[model samples]
Target: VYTEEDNISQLWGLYEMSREKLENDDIDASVSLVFGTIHEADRILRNTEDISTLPKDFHAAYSSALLAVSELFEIAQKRLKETNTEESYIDAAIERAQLGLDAPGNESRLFLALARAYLEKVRVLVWRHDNEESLANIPVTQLVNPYIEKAIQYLRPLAQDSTEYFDALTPDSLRPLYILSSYLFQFGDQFSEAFLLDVCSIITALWLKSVVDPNTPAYYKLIAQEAVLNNYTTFAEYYMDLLDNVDDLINKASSWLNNSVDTWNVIYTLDKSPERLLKLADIKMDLAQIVQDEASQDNYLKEACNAIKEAQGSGVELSPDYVEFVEAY
Candidate 1:
């Protein structure tokens, strides 16, 4: 049931031509065509792909289209990594992703790759809170800006132009709560109190905004409160829902508190009386444990028989290698 729509027609031609060329081992042409397709799709999606034109099977088509290509990209990445060639890996990922978009098909893998690949590339740029590392490499902006710009061009349409669009789910359109949490968490190093308080405020505001649906995870609210307390904000500003779920949140809070405590304990263990490190450590530990527990559940379910094993892989180092802890008595 494929009609000759302007965008789809062009992508269809590109796909066929590229496939023929690729079968002949015309890698250069294949690469060129793939990159061109990716860029073109990006351009078209941004400039013209509106929700109205999107087909009824848009969500499924879009997700499936991306997923197929993402797996290809991953294979390419693995090979490139083996050769220690980032240039090839990066280019291959972009190329395959571009090709994936050529058919206006439903591909979740493509989008997933687009999301993870772009985010992973920009890790240094966001720097989260800056203390995440200390290296004199290229500016994060330089390393990540291109990929982000390109990725967003493709992603924007899927969200803005989709009937199934949910602001909370899309990275670009993060809900007020997640947005606030991210800002607070990102700036937790400096404006700790203000940051966490703002995060707490978002939780409160969600209720006031009549948006705190029952479907929302209780842990998120607890994390917000714990974040505030750890940052030395208003302990008076409590998250009732989070606190009411004592069995779960308490364990989470205690774990977060324990982690925070251990951090300071280790710090003071080295450089005595290093300010409210204990409070900070304790709160963080509780939050971390809770989040970790949540993630564990997600992993368990995902790894179970009917789910895709797409969550984080399992060789985690588990314990932190905090310098304070390492040097502490």
Candidate 2:
């Protein structure tokens, strides 16, 4: 019968099995096995089925596998950056990452890893290609922002809500959703920040309730709440008591972002796994949930709403794409 303990045991088995395959250098087999397991679940799912209501840990295991692959990409990215020669390392990495996606796996982890792998490849390549002496005549705007904008175009849809979409998400997945939303909302013409914030925050809130872990911080949950309350400008006031220095918050977030990328770069070199993405999301939860005045929980909540509204500012008309957000339930 399905039970949490039974599921945890199954996840551990899969985890150990994957590591064994990694150790044996049976990378393809290991990759296929993880994907295969996810596919197995999908094949069994009826149109009316909802696995989240199941009493099993397959969801967590699948989530873990997704994260492990992302970490592998992260590792690879870091290792490639360290080499002075062979600027084509990123291209090779992208090929490897994409292969993981092409495999017949129904896991969201694979999709998530694939998306991130593409993101890094596009980002670093554009930067490198633009700076290359042979390509010196290219416009600066063409190299960075537009390429990034284009990359966002391809990625934003992957994260879009699909009733047809099936996957289990942990808090780790939620954090990157925030980063992706930030990128998509700002650079891509696809979505607005308010829309992204509203929709993603609500999704994050739902994910928070699932994949519950004792290790998961309460503040991450609170931050998700804060995001939905308004925009996030007032995160500062609630964040004030955590540390006297407001500037530190920005630095802290920036550092988390930098480290998240750095970690992804390293994992990319070793394994095509998603471990890094999950861990990075966990850390983001910690960073965003920094609390100050718990004495007035209501005030903190109120500030959360005001903060987001403030960031949104006044008279800034949202794009047409965001119109549906008003009716988003």
Candidate 3:
């Protein structure tokens, strides 16, 4: 009863159905359907030797199934705290994804799966160190560095490429490569320049994505926040070298402001550190001049003043830059 055609047809149906859910932001339903399909397809693929004769279009179904499952894992990552079974799911997902990768030419399909698998493993280690007091005795980097190095190895070629395959990667896939490269750069001395350029390259990709399509998903936006700030600072300085193109400077600054505001919101929720608040406010003010947005210019100045007052109220000593900006305000 479980013929190859049956498995292929089932996978095709699930892929379409899961994509609909993904579009609607129904991550739970989408991941469930996609994961189940990957599990079933993987079983069939392993048992069936003549996979070449299954169907001409069967490879398409298999490839889509692999990519869909990997993307679902990316979505699952954001909800890591919500799920008790994420560890098991990561293992299962990794096995299924590795099956797809074993098939020659399935690299494009399975790359995201492998990338996210390593990332989730690393994240769990980082999460434990962040949350558990007893685990603090163990150095977090010792646990996470190996996987971080693995991810960097896998992702560097893709992230550094100009090829069509790399171009096809979604912003979601690119963010991990960006963040992991930054992490890798912190550890290695000799390759620091290479890794920093990788970081800059990813920032350019994300920056271009913003210019072409501003309505990036919330998950993609969140992943981009830290990368943006780090690279934004870099570009803010680098823009001086690019002064020939005024519009380029303005566009970069504009997008920097967009990403910075979202990042600031996240930091603000954790704690309203006066230092951070003032720094963000200063960037906002600077960006306003680049774009000549008077409303935002005034708004950022007001926010800087208010943040300084709140910091004083909370008995936090102001940074020197904070005092200068606040006094100017």
Q: How do all models score by TM-score? A: 0.28, 0.34, 0.51
Better candidate by TM-score, 1 or 2: 2
Q: Write the per-residue lDDT of candidate 1 for residues 1-329, one digit (tens) a residue.
A: 53335665565456445545655877556555554555555555666536445432232223322322332353334423355443334444544445455445555435544544454444424553254455335554454547655554444443332324221232211222332344334434444445444445434332222222435344433333333334322222122135744565455445434444543443344343323343443344334434446775443333221111111122212124332332331
Off by over 4 Å in 3: 1-20, 50-84, 99-102, 131-135, 165-168, 173-194, 199-230, 234-281, 284-329
Candidate 3 overall Cα lDDT vs. reference?
Answer: 0.58
Q: Residue 320 in model 2: shift from native, Å?
A: 39
Question: In terms of TM-score, which candidate is stronger, 1 or 3?
Answer: 3
**Compared with the true structure, what per-residue lDDT tens digits does model 3 show for residues 1-329?**
77666776676677777767876989889878766776666677688887654553345455445545444656655644555355556555555555554454535435544665666667666778888897888876777877766655555444443423432355544545554644544443344544655655644554344323346455544445555565655455444335544776667656755665765676455454555666566666666556556786777668767866777677778778777867776
Q: What local lDDT does model 1 show for residue 274?
A: 27
Model 1 lDDT, full chain set: 0.40
Best by lDDT: 3
Higher-scoring candidate on TM-score, 2 or 3 = 3
Point out where model 1 deviates above 4 Å: 1-91, 106-109, 124-137, 158-161, 165-329
Model 2: per-residue Cα lDDT over 1-329, one tens digit each: 76444544565466557656865877765665555544443443332154344322344344445444444443333433444332343344344434444333343544444444445544455556667886577654354554345434434444455423333343434444454444444443444535544444444444434333435455444444333222232232223333554666555444433444444443334343333333333333334455333554344334334433332354334344322322231
Weakest ten-residue segment in model 2 by summed lDDT: 229-238
TM-score, structure 3 vs. true: 0.51
Model 1 poorest ten-residue lDDT run: 305-314
Q: What C-alpha RMSD separates each model from the true structure?
A: 16.3, 17.4, 10.2
Quote the positional error of residue 280 for candidate 3 in Å. 10
